[PDB]
């Protein structure tokens, strides 16, 4: 039984791409109108970050210690790799996403029962060929806007 208040294991995580019309943030728990990607061999979600803003004047009395405040936040870049399958609809959809410029929505569903949602455009598409291994497809997506985190919903 999934429990948001206890640690889980990463196994079982699935990746989804929104296709259709509507608001992706409205019902992230929905599974209708959501394409799915099969057998992701690795998945590293993007790292949220922000840059420092200097808060210092000439009139300030104390200047021994620096003082900075949060500046402009930005969602990171999400990169995952998955088995190369030119026949499936999901990967043809991925290359359609890359070839024509667009910012779509993708979603991550942990075994914990919470759901993480992002919006962005894809930036890189690569392969990996080896004599005795499965051909893999490597994808990197650059996020835009404000992500809807997993625990915004309680």
């Amino acid at each position: 039984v999934p429990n948001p208040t206890m640690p889980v294991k990463g196994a079982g995580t699935t990746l989804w791409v929104y296709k259709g019309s509507g608001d992706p943030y409205a019902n992230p728990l929905s599974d209708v109108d959501w394409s799915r990607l099969a057998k992701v061999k690795d998945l590293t979600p993007g790292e949220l970050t922000a840059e420092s803003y200097d808060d210092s004047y000439l009139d300030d009395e104390d200047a021994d210690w620096t003082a900075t405040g949060q500046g402009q936040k930005s969602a990171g870049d999400t990169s995952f790799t998955l088995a190369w399958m030119p026949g499936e609809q999901g990967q043809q959809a991925l290359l359609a996403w890359f070839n024509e410029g667009d910012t779509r929505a993708y979603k991550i569903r942990f075994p914990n029962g919470t759901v993480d949602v992002f919006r962005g455009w894809v930036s890189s598409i690569g392969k990996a060929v080896t004599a005795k291994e499965v051909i893999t497809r490597t994808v990197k997506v650059t996020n835009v806007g404000r992500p809807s985190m997993a625990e915004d919903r309680s």
Partner: protein
């Protein structure tokens, strides 16, 4: 998935070619001089790979071992290991459904010097499947 299915799928397509040899399914195998050229198939050393996030992955090593009388010339064993087993084991149509990846590994020879009753030579494969 079920090791019974995989061994059966190997042996079915290993039997259609005429060899005139007794085939043993599974590890336990007992014989004597009469039924001697005997080919046994077994799976060993299963392990949890944990390669993909989506579902389970396991690695097991597939073995095809052939037993021939001691003091048989080496060149005869070469033939059994290359000509008969290696071509058939490359492409099994019924195998591709169960196994995601099958990688060859080298075969090797061993003889019995304790009593001189048997000389075997097994081909080893690496199997990656889903359970």
């Amino acid at each position: 998935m079920k090791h019974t299915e995989l061994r059966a799928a190997v042996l079915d397509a290993l039997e259609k070619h005429d060899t005139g040899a007794t085939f043993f399914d599974g590890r336990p195998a007992v014989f004597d001089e009469a039924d001697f050229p005997a080919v046994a198939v077994y799976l060993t050393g299963a392990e949890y790979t944990g390669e993909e996030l989506d579902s389970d992955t396991w690695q097991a090593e597939l073995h095809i071992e052939v037993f021939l009388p001691a003091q048989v010339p080496d060149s005869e064993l070469d033939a059994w290991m290359e000509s008969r087993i290696y071509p058939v084991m490359s492409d099994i149509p019924a195998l591709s459904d169960l196994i995601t990846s099958m990688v060859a590994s080298g075969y090797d020879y061993r003889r019995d010097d304790d009593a001189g009753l048997w000389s075997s030579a097994d081909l080893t494969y690496v199997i990656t499947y889903e359970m």
